Write an enzyme that holds these catalytic residues in place. Sequence first.
Site, PDB file in Angstrom:
ATOM      1  N   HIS A 192      -7.326  -7.341  -0.306  1.00 49.56           N
ATOM      2  CA  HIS A 192      -6.948  -6.029  -0.812  1.00 49.56           C
ATOM      3  C   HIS A 192      -7.367  -4.962   0.187  1.00 49.56           C
ATOM      4  O   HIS A 192      -8.441  -5.051   0.787  1.00 49.56           O
ATOM      5  CB  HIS A 192      -7.588  -5.757  -2.181  1.00 49.56           C
ATOM      6  N   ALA A 193      -6.513  -3.962   0.360  1.00 51.24           N
ATOM      7  CA  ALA A 193      -6.804  -2.828   1.228  1.00 51.24           C
ATOM      8  C   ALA A 193      -6.042  -1.620   0.691  1.00 51.24           C
ATOM      9  O   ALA A 193      -5.623  -1.603  -0.470  1.00 51.24           O
ATOM     10  CB  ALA A 193      -6.464  -3.162   2.691  1.00 51.24           C
ATOM     11  N   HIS A 221       0.527   5.567  -5.825  1.00 53.18           N
ATOM     12  CA  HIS A 221      -0.783   5.931  -5.288  1.00 53.18           C
ATOM     13  C   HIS A 221      -0.794   5.853  -3.765  1.00 53.18           C
ATOM     14  O   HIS A 221      -1.304   6.751  -3.086  1.00 53.18           O
ATOM     15  CB  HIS A 221      -1.855   5.019  -5.884  1.00 53.18           C
ATOM     16  N   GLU A 222      -0.226   4.782  -3.209  1.00 51.46           N
ATOM     17  CA  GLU A 222      -0.208   4.631  -1.757  1.00 51.46           C
ATOM     18  C   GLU A 222       0.732   5.631  -1.098  1.00 51.46           C
ATOM     19  O   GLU A 222       0.455   6.102   0.011  1.00 51.46           O
ATOM     20  CB  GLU A 222       0.174   3.202  -1.378  1.00 51.46           C
ATOM     21  N   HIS A 262      -1.274   8.645  -0.862  1.00 54.81           N
ATOM     22  CA  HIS A 262      -2.187   8.489   0.266  1.00 54.81           C
ATOM     23  C   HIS A 262      -1.492   8.822   1.581  1.00 54.81           C
ATOM     24  O   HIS A 262      -2.024   9.568   2.412  1.00 54.81           O
ATOM     25  CB  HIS A 262      -2.724   7.057   0.302  1.00 54.81           C
ATOM     26  N   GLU A 286      -7.337  10.107  -3.458  1.00 56.50           N
ATOM     27  CA  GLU A 286      -6.867   9.320  -4.590  1.00 56.50           C
ATOM     28  C   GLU A 286      -6.355  10.214  -5.712  1.00 56.50           C
ATOM     29  O   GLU A 286      -5.369   9.877  -6.376  1.00 56.50           O
ATOM     30  CB  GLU A 286      -7.985   8.409  -5.095  1.00 56.50           C
ATOM     31  N   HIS A 307     -15.166  -4.051  -2.664  1.00 62.17           N
ATOM     32  CA  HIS A 307     -15.752  -2.891  -2.008  1.00 62.17           C
ATOM     33  C   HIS A 307     -17.214  -3.096  -1.639  1.00 62.17           C
ATOM     34  O   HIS A 307     -17.753  -2.313  -0.854  1.00 62.17           O
ATOM     35  CB  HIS A 307     -15.613  -1.665  -2.907  1.00 62.17           C
ATOM     36  N   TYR A 347     -13.475   6.863  -6.546  1.00 61.18           N
ATOM     37  CA  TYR A 347     -12.519   6.557  -7.603  1.00 61.18           C
ATOM     38  C   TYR A 347     -12.884   7.251  -8.908  1.00 61.18           C
ATOM     39  O   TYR A 347     -12.004   7.762  -9.605  1.00 61.18           O
ATOM     40  CB  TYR A 347     -12.417   5.045  -7.800  1.00 61.18           C
TER      41      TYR A 347
END
EC number: 3.4.15.1
Lengths: 53, 522, 65
Positions: free
Chosen positions: B304-305, B334-335, B338, B362, B464, B474
Amino acid sequence: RPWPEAMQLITGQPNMSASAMLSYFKPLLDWLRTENELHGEKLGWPQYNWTPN
Amino acid sequence: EYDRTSQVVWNEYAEANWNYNTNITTETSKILLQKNMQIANHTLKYGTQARKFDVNQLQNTTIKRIIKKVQDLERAALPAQELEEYNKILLDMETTYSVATVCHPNGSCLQLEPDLTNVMATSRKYEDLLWAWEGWRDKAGRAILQFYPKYVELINQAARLNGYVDAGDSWRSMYETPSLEQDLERLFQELQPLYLNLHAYVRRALHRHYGAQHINLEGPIPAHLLGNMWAQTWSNIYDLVVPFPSAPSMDTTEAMLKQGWTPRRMFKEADDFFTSLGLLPVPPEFWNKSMLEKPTDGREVVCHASAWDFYNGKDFRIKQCTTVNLEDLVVAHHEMGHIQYFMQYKDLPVALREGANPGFHEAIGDVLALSVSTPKHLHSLNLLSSEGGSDEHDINFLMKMALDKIAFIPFSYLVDQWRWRVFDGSITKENYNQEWWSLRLKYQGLCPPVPRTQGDFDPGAKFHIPSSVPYIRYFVSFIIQFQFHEALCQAAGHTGPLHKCDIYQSKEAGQRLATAMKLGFS
Amino acid sequence: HDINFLMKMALDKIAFIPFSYLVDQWRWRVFDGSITKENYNQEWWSLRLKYQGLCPPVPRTQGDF
Ligand SMILES: *[C@@H]1O[C@H](CO)[C@@H](O)[C@H](O)[C@H]1NC(C)=O
Ligand SMILES: *[C@@H]1O[C@H](CO)[C@@H](O)[C@H](O)[C@H]1NC(C)=O
């Protein structure tokens, strides 16, 4: 007068240290460490989530 | 001069990161290590040059901000041997978390991202869920616990050399708030009652399903009976906690199957919504140069990234691949947020090319995602929902949206609370897991399904934790995005039922977002 | 004889050190507002387990104090 002055008057240093307590129990600490290593036991409680019932 | 050299250095470093995260081998690891050494060298040189400067007597703001941000060397403050050891430790933890696969020794083996997450979110049998949860926690935590104390010590040393206090101040200083902890505690205490009510309702539903042997009315719910391996966003599958099953309740499972709904067209829809909001579009090279689907071989990516920026003004790729789902759509939004945030302040200098606040990234990415998830906008795009026609539909949508974005607040607080405590020495190595589970019991309402003895590094299961990125961003973003949505809905000319207010061709709201989002870190 | 006497004195004093460190620690955390009221016994037993290494013989629910 503040505490450190009386601490220095009684002993000589204006600080609290556990060195005297460790030195007092040094023979017991050494013998207990030897017995524990002989009996094959680990320090601490690495099963903390344990309850007898 | 610093901007001029940093642009190319960081562009090359990001290219190396791409190559490592897509073509995972040992040559990629070697190249990544040596390019980390190179970027550390450059940062050390320019930070040493900037250390001769004085920030206090500089009579300006922007140049003062640049010098202040360049003053610290971050990781590059360690000695050569210590820096090499720290890089090796971080790479080892990342590569032992990404490749870890837990399976029955019978022969069949499963991976976290493809199968384990799917088999946990889909299955409803207690034993299978327990097996998956316990096995993953076992393998990942026991792999990472060997390294973690060394990483803690090295990061503490680096932060102390940088002038901070034990690597908690270093990560809390990104918010420029001397009273950050108190404010976050106050916010959590404010959100506590709603979370408690939701926890009670979910516990009732789980007791209805699984019975009384596993879950009792008085007490915590086991941490594996929720839907996620970490229960961060639990019961996103709300089929078990639906208040009353109504006919007009949305399905959102076949509405993206009979129309195809490929990931490419879902990202196209997200970009179209972004443009219709009134924001500049993503370059055309992104779709045909990035990757968002399954591979043609065995080695594809890390687990995940997030989105990656190359600081050179053209490369704004996105790495997430999760096949097709509604959660996939919200993650794509969301991305896209970003990327649009990374792209808005291209004009700013590289040192300010970070974002106003680590949570702002975020929050701004997810506010539009929250806006688009309402049944009205779904009705306006490929679906037919009752919208505000029936109050029962509204309450069902509210419950489904609150199983997200709530029950994630306690976890997002808890992870960084534990990490702050361990960094500052309050959590000794001997009780890494006991304090983590005490926090799990205290903030959330979860209990370990199996007696978790010392020697199990449960916090290492979160990505994380070994990857060493802050997590309280977050929590901050989830707090802030609702404020952002409230303001943007106010700019829409109507508030009414804010829970179903939708933003679409709101030019003034997009302009207001842009004028305060183009500022960046300035 | 020396070992027996030292063991008795250790049982007297060193067994007392952690409890005396933990009780006022719990009270200080209570006064500071870091314990609230919902979890009075939970944090007390967490401190007992962390410092003195003792476990509740019977499940101590909330409301026991
Ligand atoms: C990925 O790694 C392989 C290893 O054989 C290499 O041949 C290939 O060139 C790499 N991919 C690209 C796009 O260069
Ligand atoms: C980093 O700079 C030092 C300066 O002494 C030099 O010796 C070393 O070779 C440099 N490393 C790289 C990878 O450029």
